Design a binder for this molecule. Structure first.
Ligand SMILES: OC[C@@H]1CC2(CCCC2)CN1c1ncnc2[nH]ccc12
Length: 167
């Protein structure tokens, strides 16, 4: 039993809500919040910019030190950093940017990172500026993640569309 509230159950292990992941994190303070990152951990907009703003830029400061030491992430890859005031940990996950010609097959690799954590609060990956089909991303999530994932989807029209569709 956990403290997530108002989620619609999609499968044994996947749940979804029309919500801002930032607000869900502040309310729930989960063990792991997932960031929809880029390989440089430059948190400008969308999920990443919003999470970073909520940490008063501490996420960006920590991320810049990570990159200076380790170099960029791989598309499809991830790293675990602090969750700051939002969660214990933040799992920064890079989905493919379809608008940059990156292989959509890497979306499955991106979601595989979630399986290293028993419970996660997460966004849908590769949407927004990355330009992947959100219905496809949800199907990949459901067909790839085996651990317990709570998906917070910002756009009301997007949420209504996703929960009224057969995956
Ligand atoms: O789940 C992925 C969705 C998809 C969006 C890009 C196009 C429509 C919206 C951004 N995003 C978010 N989801 C949950 N919390 C969020 N907080 C700030 C952004 C955000």
């Amino acid at each position: 039993v956990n403290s997530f509230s108002g989620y619609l159950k999609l499968t044994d292990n996947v749940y979804i809500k029309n919500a801002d992941i930032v607000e869900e994190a502040k309310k729930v303070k989960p063990t792991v919040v997932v960031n929809a990152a880029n390989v440089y951990l430059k948190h400008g907009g969308g999920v990443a910019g919003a999470l970073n703003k909520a940490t008063n830029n501490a996420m960006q400061v920590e991320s810049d030190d990570y990159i200076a030491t380790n170099g960029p992430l791989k598309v499809g890859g991830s790293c675990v950093l602090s969750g700051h005031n939002l969660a214990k940990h933040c799992l920064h996950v890079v989905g493919p940017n379809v608008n940059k010609g990156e292989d959509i097959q890497l979306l499955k690799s991106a979601y595989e990172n979630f399986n290293q954590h028993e419970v996660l609060l997460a966004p849908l990956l590769s949407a927004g500026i990355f330009g992947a089909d959100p219905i496809h991303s949800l199907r990949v999530c459901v067909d790839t993640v085996r651990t317990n994932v709570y998906l917070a989807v910002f756009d009301k029209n997007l949420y209504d569309k996703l929960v009224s569709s057969f995956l």
